[PDB]
Symmetry: C3
Subunit: 440 residues, 3 copies
């Protein structure tokens, strides 16, 4: 136990974060508690498509405070190294990807994919003092993943369902988000939000519309939660009223430290997020859709490419800033707000969510938060993160390192009000990726 560990409840409501814990969770740079924790997991760096071909243009990428450079060498292996030449500090973005390496444009020093210095023109014997940081990589889901932690503790690469399926079952997008990773992830472990800001989007949008779940979601925002701790993270049982006999359970899966699997809408593709910290004020927000049984159709895949569903349209090509952003007021339409075609005045799943999270300021004011029951999932995920971060300081091994425990699924069920859903899911969600999808 460490003083920082906040109590779960205070005066009979859930308790907010104390100052130190606020910091433990938000500060992600090198040699921070959370910086060190996050380094132990495989990290999604960028998409394979951004560095498609060998000897192709390198791209700058910033993760967990460090500034890096991604490129694909001559053999075709995706590599990731530090952005800066060890010589006089110039950027290797201006260098030359060729002959299995990056060669600095200033004086010709060359580094390979592991950041080993392999040529120094003026001084061949200096190689060993010119090494820079290079990080191992693997490709899965159409994403380049990197391992940024101590060499001896590198785990098995992740085996989430969208990472194991064949390519054309899967579709991935990413968006830059002008806020700290925490508040953003917090948004996808809060199913009560869907009943308010998304109330009217849920009907027009092709990845969501025309399924029976919507009648129940629309008609009750008041979500009671049950939370079960597991080898991979948490399972979130979000209860709403079904019929008068019954309850609509949405079960979303939180896979520590930064993944969700969202409970389905009908036979529409399954959805998921990742959030990756760029610094303490920004993050990559990843969105994944995938179908377990058939390929994605063309009307599915194309709808995603146009930026419907949990995806977005971009400001300019290869921008990764959304079309709706803090410069155009996120497209606010007050007229639409009055006529009840949009709750917030903003259009689009993604925008409706990040508009609000950006508006909190880069880091949410944790001091001024006053929590409610709908925040049960959030509070527990915070504890798991804090206790892992603090535990790693003290030499404990962090949770969820074992990829085989990540073969799981979200779900929806209608159930009588006396049936216990945790028991139900013991029965039904064992070996869940072999069964079809539990849906409504």
């Amino acid at each position: 136990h460490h003083h920082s560990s906040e109590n779960l409840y205070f005066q009979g409501h859930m308790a907010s974060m104390n100052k130190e814990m606020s910091e433990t969770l938000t500060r992600v740079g090198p040699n921070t508690r959370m910086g060190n924790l996050l380094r132990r997991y495989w990290v999604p760096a960028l998409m394979s498509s951004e560095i498609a071909e060998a000897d192709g243009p390198q791209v700058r990428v910033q993760l967990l405070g460090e500034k890096l450079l991604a490129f694909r060498n001559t053999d075709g292996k995706a590599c990731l190294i530090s952005e800066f030449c060890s010589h006089r500090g110039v950027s290797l973005y201006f260098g030359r990807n060729e002959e299995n390496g990056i060669r600095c444009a200033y004086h010709g020093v060359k580094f390979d994919g592991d950041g080993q210095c392999v040529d120094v023109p003026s001084s061949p014997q200096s190689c060993a003092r010119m090494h820079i940081k290079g990080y191992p990589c693997v490709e899965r889901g159409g994403i380049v993943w990197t391992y940024m932690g101590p060499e001896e503790h590198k785990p098995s690469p992740p085996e989430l369902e969208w990472c194991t399926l064949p390519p054309e079952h899967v579709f991935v997008s990413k968006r830059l988000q002008y806020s700290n990773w925490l508040q953003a992830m917090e948004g996808g472990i809060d199913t009560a939000h869907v009943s308010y800001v998304h109330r009217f989007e849920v009907d027009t949008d092709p990845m969501h519309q025309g399924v029976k779940a919507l009648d129940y979601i629309k008609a009750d925002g008041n979500v009671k939660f049950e939370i079960e701790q597991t080898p991979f993270g948490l399972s979130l049982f979000g209860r709403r009223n079904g019929e008068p006999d019954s309850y609509y359970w949405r079960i979303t899966q939180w896979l520590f430290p930064w993944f969700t699997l969202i409970a389905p809408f009908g036979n529409h593709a399954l959805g998921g997020h990742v959030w990756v910290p760029i610094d303490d004020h920004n993050c990559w927000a990843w969105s994944i859709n995938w179908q377990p049984d058939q390929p994605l159709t063309k009307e599915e895949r194309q709808s995603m490419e146009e930026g419907k569903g949990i995806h977005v349209e971009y400001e300019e090509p290869g921008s990764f800033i959304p079309k709706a952003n803090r410069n155009n007021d996120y497209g606010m339409d007050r007229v639409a707000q009055r006529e009840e075609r949009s709750y917030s005045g903003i259009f689009g799943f993604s925008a409706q969510d990040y508009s609000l999270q950006e508006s909190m300021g880069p880091i949410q004011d944790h001091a001024a938060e006053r929590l409610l029951p709908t925040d049960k999932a959030i509070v527990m995920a915070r504890r798991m993160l804090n206790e892992a971060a603090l535990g790693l300081e003290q030499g404990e091994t962090p949770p969820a390192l074992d990829a085989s425990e990540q073969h799981v699924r979200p779900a929806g069920v209608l159930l009588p009000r006396d049936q216990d859903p945790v028991a139900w899911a013991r029965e039904e969600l064992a070996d869940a990726t072999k069964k079809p999808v539990f849906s409504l």
Copy 2:
């Protein structure tokens, strides 16, 4: 007395501000000395026209360091609350103005105009812990005023002449100014400025031109001052040479803490300012024109709408940034400067003044100021402000709280050089809003 109180004179010239006093007067945020002083007066928040209709789009407004949200409820009452949901800190700009309240777009918590939480979906019993800051409001002059101080010390709403007249006698505009409130207000208690930067504007401009005062103003920048302290603030007797027998007295009224009434030009409408701090580096600069006797004509009102006189044209619609600003060099025309159609090279009353005040940097370098005689009004207003601010710390009641003492007028008179103007004004400016305007 407090060490901060600077002496009025040093080595036979007027004395500049010491470091602490510099700070006492410029730092306007919550729980500062000047923050607390200013909170005791009614504060001009925004114009009624910006939130014209009920259930209409709320607007963000920042005053005295705090970030707020203004809107007009269903009954039609202008309200002003804190910008941020008490729940998880999201902006209420994205919420819903309806049924006498703002409802947060994220999870549906609703606040009324006094910032009382009136609905919590997930937890009806939590209402009392979810309150936010809400501030009483009143409408006068076409302006929404708010009272931001302790509840028990709220005074009578202000009774300045342009606040009591009927609407069509009055016209109000506001402009965003990229500098601290102090240096800006200081500019409208410095009538010597008019003889230099405005020398050539005073003739072309329809709210100023073709009156006899101009010959005397143009022909003498060297203004001797007499200052009389009063219940409402200060009276500023600015002396210039008239004929060889006489003196042209411009009497401007400074109404503590942040108002002026400017001495008239002819029968042209009367003019006035307010300056309101947004933060320590910016302020709203308000300009008011009004006619006591008749309505404003259409050529008057329209000229003001086009941005002549003490008003401005805007960069874009509903911007409140001026057409001439720090990005276009305030429109500088050096050719016009050489040909003596503009002193500074810049066109427009307002621009000619704020161009210079913005150029001092956000906060004037008080350490490096070397004062002259034309700065007599400035020095005294500084003392009144410092002594009120410091006195409030020590439990003294601040000046000018009583609205009835604000029924006053500015004036111009030609007078023989032996006649004392203070005596003159005892006689003539008693009950001044009942008489016509003393002018030239």
Copy 3:
């Protein structure tokens, strides 16, 4: 000796800067060690052409941390004063250049070219307390130079070759550079760079192309250095392989504290730089071309005006920001990079160099530099600067104050591998501006 003085070598490689020395050299503002050192030399402020005519528009100029104003008075003398009115701190950019002075636009105070206050309307006796900083000036090379140091130590104005020649032998340009003066100057005392980033530019460009030096430069980046200390700065003997019998020596001249003369390419005009600190994060980079024997032709002069050679094309007219800059990715063409028409992917001498130096961040990370042999000149210039800066603190007189020692030239020679170049240059580079140019 002062602890700061770093050792020249560590573990058999050249040693990087310690923390304090890093600071000694980069911090250039008033009352810093390096601020004080640099003040003792004549400083290039701006070009004569920017303030061509008398009573012409003044221009803002920022040097060595101070913010100034340059203008040409009625007599025609270039003057330089502090930007700000001593009265209430307004900018004199808005004032009036006429009758041998600048008159403030606010209240009419006037200053002459030495910063003496010569008129105060409200108070003639106040003149002596209203003085501001004014700095003596002289014109040479088409540049206004100013002397910003104590009055009693003003030296003779500089007698560099391009300062003494007649106007039409000479051409000067300047560019704003988004980095500290040091790393930029460091770039022009590093001839090994030319073999890499400039490899392909050296052939297409009319101030460089079609001369025999290129074959030798292209074919060896591995530059051995010999450095000889002199009255004016350092002489840099950069050795590359010539034929198998011989060595191509490029001798560049570093004239303390911030000038270079670059070793020639053929009969193409001679080239030189200056770097002048604006603040700790930016600098003016000056480029000079000149021909000693004939005028510059029209195809020479015009090519320079179009921004070829060590000059640049600008973003907009009178901008001084380059066409290629940090906003357009410096024009990167990866296709050209692959097809070996550009090493870095960037086009243009100047851009190829400053792209890399800007990319280090405003101040190079001196802690993380790992030096190589090609950095011999850099290391020594750093010592000369540190020891002068530290010595001035202790009352020692700084080096290179004597203009007559600046009548020198750069050179290239092919030489047998047994001939010593320093001896060669004793013989040949005595009285070098009287001889023709040693070239290849």
